């Protein structure tokens, strides 16, 4: 290739503007580049991972530096309940004087932004107290970023390139990751918690210059190597303990108390240290499973080959799957993305109900922002997991080497799978929408007692099995004489039950008929999104409408107007369709979370209990009611500090609307219009002196779908982010 | 009339001039340089 892109000769000879657009859009698709080999593929990916790590380190270093330079961390650690954390300063020449006055918050001397990422609480909990600590953390992170870049450059050199066989040594990598990357890192973290964080919460200041002179525990490694580990749990912090001071401070370093800290409303630090020690032990044990160099361990290939049921109902079982997984990077990426997307939602659901950072729980805006952020990230990752699974079937799947194993039988009964998913989604949608409309009609006619309100009894029974006593079920932990409650009677049940039965935290919130309908809406969204993605993945290789789909690739526009029409027939188009459903589903769960929490923080849960049973309640008491302060950020009488979010609300609306243009109007209309503009330019005096070098053409069919989806998603994210932050920050719950 | 020299000179000198002018701006020219002049407003629930 003589021009750009240099990795695609076919794109380089394109005489239109499309050469540029596509060159940007296919930069990281190394598999489709000119003269590509497997060794080059693996080495390029290995190098790119180092750059991604360097970017991650630089971002954290920037955050730390700006908090230390322009923040109010030292004033915040003395009044966490009454000081607004500062992210960074503002220097905009476009600001007017009222904007300069309105944005001077905290204790700053100029316009600043209030941080809603929760970094202040996280850093305060882990022992950081002064601006110098953040300054020296930022330098270390910059050093790490530089070293990652250096390693990325080094392993690209001729004498340090790793071979393909090294990248395919799954057993050694699994052993090292399970034992070193997971186990040893957790042991180091609990070491930090024992040595710095826990002393820090009791008024002890431990740093690099004195950590070799201070005993983390009075007994000092005696009990550990003797065996009487209980001496590390004897004297925990009292319930009257104040965080950061020695008032009511104990000496224990590893406990099993359960529940929350009375003042900080978060998990005990000793419980966290014990948890990380236990997880480190578990991962260190698990990292000794696979055979590497010493004649002991397991072979994953033999394990997969030996797991064939003798009855023959699974065919050849898992035989041969080791080679398909090991030789396909898309299979590995899909598995990793599915697991990571599951645990991102797990983190989101566990962080709001079991806060781990000091004084996070009563910072409502930060909690809402974090939950929404992590749930939307999980939603995108889960779509990626299915997209790459679909790509695997086209590019890497070998039907002959996978004869009658568990992976071919899925393609065998794809129709049975897709039809049943369709039935489930249809049933859920029909009945949820019907119940919602019935309740709406009853509320319209002035007869709220005719509503169909189903009690979520299964989930209430599960809550009562965890010890909640608001429903009077008396099962398992809610019972007094059972074996389950008797077993943990004196270890963790007291604190856990006290936290669970405390009705002003987010631990097992009371649920009613309003939750039953929204949970089924969430289930319908999940089922429909999985239906779209699974249908796209299982039909990627071909169907009755297009038997030779695998011959055209993962992303192609169509097969033309013949055979009735073939719009959106490629597997990429299934992902493009499923992104809308993922966004809708995540919006539903975030609406539910935000409305359920904003009413609980206001002291009136009954507003949500009665108004969530019909959709007009959602429209009026959640959207309309909570947009009064946001839309008043700037008005003909002045402005306040909420003007940024008011501007971003309309910005997101505008981008969302602009995306509809690319999603509705298609290419030929625009190409025929661009022809006229080309003629007009060629016939205009004093403009004939200027000539284009790339022929102007309309956006491609697939390019326009991507552009419209990007605009749709950007508007969707920005509008809700502005609304959520402004609504939770106008009143602070 | 040297296009190679003109591009470098224009870009670098324009950037330096922009930085210098921004660094020499007074509070009368830019409200952001003047800074706040009013006592700060309090938070919704007593936060500062």
């Amino acid at each position: 290739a003589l021009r750009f892109p240099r990795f695609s000769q076919g794109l380089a000879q394109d005489p239109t503007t499309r050469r540029i657009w596509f060159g940007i859009a296919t930069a990281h698709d190394f598999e489709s580049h000119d003269d590509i080999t497997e060794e080059r593929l693996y080495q390029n990916i290995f190098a790119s991972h180092f750059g991604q790590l360097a970017i991650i380190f630089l971002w954290t270093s920037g955050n730390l530096f700006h908090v230390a330079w322009q923040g109010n961390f030292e004033s915040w650690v003395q009044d966490p309940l009454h000081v607004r954390p500062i992210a960074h300063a503002i220097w905009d020449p476009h600001f007017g004087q009222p904007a300069v006055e309105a944005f001077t918050r905290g204790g700053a001397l100029g316009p600043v932004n209030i941080a809603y990422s929760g970094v202040y609480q996280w850093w305060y909990t882990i022992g950081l107290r002064t601006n110098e600590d953040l300054y020296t953390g930022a330098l270390f992170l910059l050093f790490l970023s530089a070293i990652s870049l250096i390693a990325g450059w080094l392993h690209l050199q001729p004498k340090w390139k790793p071979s393909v066989s090294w990248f395919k040594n799954a057993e050694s990598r699994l052993n090292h990751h399970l034992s070193g990357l997971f186990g040893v890192s957790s042991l180091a973290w609990t070491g930090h918690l024992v040595h710095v964080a826990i002393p820090g919460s009791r008024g002890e200041y431990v740093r690099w210059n004195n950590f070799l002179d201070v005993l983390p525990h009075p007994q000092g490694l005696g009990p550990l190597f003797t065996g009487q580990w209980n001496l590390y749990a004897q004297n925990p912090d009292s319930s009257s303990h104040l965080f950061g001071t020695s008032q009511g401070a104990g000496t224990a370093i590893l406990t099993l108390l359960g529940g929350f800290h009375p003042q900080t409303q978060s998990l005990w630090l000793t419980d966290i240290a014990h948890h990380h020690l236990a997880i480190a032990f578990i991962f260190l044990v698990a990292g000794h499973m696979y055979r590497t160099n010493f004649g002991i361990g397991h072979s994953i290939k033999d394990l997969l080959d030996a797991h064939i049921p003798p009855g023959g109902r699974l065919g050849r079982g898992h035989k041969g799957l080791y080679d398909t997984i090991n030789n396909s990077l898309h299979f590995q990426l899909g598995l990793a993305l599915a697991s990571l997307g599951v645990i991102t939602s797990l983190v989101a659901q566990h962080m709001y109900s079991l806060p781990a950072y000091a004084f996070i729980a009563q910072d409502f805006t930060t909690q809402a922002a974090l939950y929404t952020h992590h749930q939307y990230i999980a939603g995108f990752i889960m779509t990626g997991a299915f997209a790459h699974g679909a790509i695997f079937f086209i590019r890497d799947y070998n039907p002959e080497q996978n004869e009658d194993n568990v992976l071919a039988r899925m393609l065998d009964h794809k129709e049975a799978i897709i039809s049943h998913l369709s039935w489930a989604s249809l049933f859920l949608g029909f009945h949820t929408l019907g119940l919602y409309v019935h309740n709406d009609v009853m509320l319209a006619f002035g007869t709220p007692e005719k509503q169909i309100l189903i009690e979520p009894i299964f989930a209430q029974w599960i809550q009562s099995a965890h010890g909640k006593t608001s429903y009077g079920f008396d099962v398992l932990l809610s019972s007094t004489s059972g074996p389950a409650f008797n077993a943990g009677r004196s270890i963790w049940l007291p604190g856990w039950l006290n936290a669970v039965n405390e009705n002003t935290n987010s631990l097992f919130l009371t649920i009613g008929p309003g939750d039953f309908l929204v949970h089924h809406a969430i289930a319908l969204g999940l089922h429909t999104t999985t239906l779209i993605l699974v249908k796209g993945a299982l039909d990627a290789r071909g169907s009755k409408l297009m038997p030779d789909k695998k011959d055209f690739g993962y992303s192609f526009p169509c097969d033309g107007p013949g055979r009735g029409g073939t719009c959106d027939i490629s597997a990429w188009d299934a992902f493009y369709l499923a992104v809308f459903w993922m966004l809708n589903t995540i919006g539903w769960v975030t609406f539910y979370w935000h409305w359920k929490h904003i009413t609980l923080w206001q002291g009136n849960v009954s507003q949500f209990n009665e108004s969530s049973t019909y959709l007009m309640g959602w429209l009026r008491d959640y959207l309309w009611l909570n947009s009064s302060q946001l839309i008043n950020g700037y008005n003909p009488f002045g402005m306040n500090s909420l003007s940024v979010w008011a501007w971003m609300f309309l910005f997101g609306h505008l981008v969302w609307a602009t995306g509809f243009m690319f999603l509705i109007s298609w290419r030929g209309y625009w190409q025929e219009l661009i022809e006229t503009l080309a003629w007009a330019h060629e016939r205009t005096p004093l403009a004939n002196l200027i000539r284009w070098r790339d022929k102007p053409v309309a956006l491609s069919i697939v390019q326009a779908r991507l552009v419209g989806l990007a605009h749709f998603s950007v508007g969707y994210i920005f509008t809700y982010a502005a609304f959520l932050i402004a609504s939770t920050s106008g009143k602070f719950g | 009339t040297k296009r190679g020299l003109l591009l470098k000179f224009l870009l670098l000198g324009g950037g330096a001039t922009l930085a210098f002018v921004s660094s020499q701006a007074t509070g009368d020219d830019l409200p952001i340089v003047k800074g706040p002049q009013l006592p700060p407003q309090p938070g919704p629930r007593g936060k500062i």
Binding site: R3, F4, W91 | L7, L11, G14, G15, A19, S22, A25
Partner: peptide
């Protein structure tokens, strides 16, 4: 001090230099 100098550099000068360089790169040959 620094923001009054750095903001014009990152917001105006650096994007202009990068755009000029990238345009000259993509118009090559």
């Amino acid at each position: 001090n620094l923001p009054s100098i750095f903001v014009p550099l990152v917001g105006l000068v650096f994007p202009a230099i990068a755009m000029a360089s990238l345009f000259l790169h993509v118009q090559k040959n």
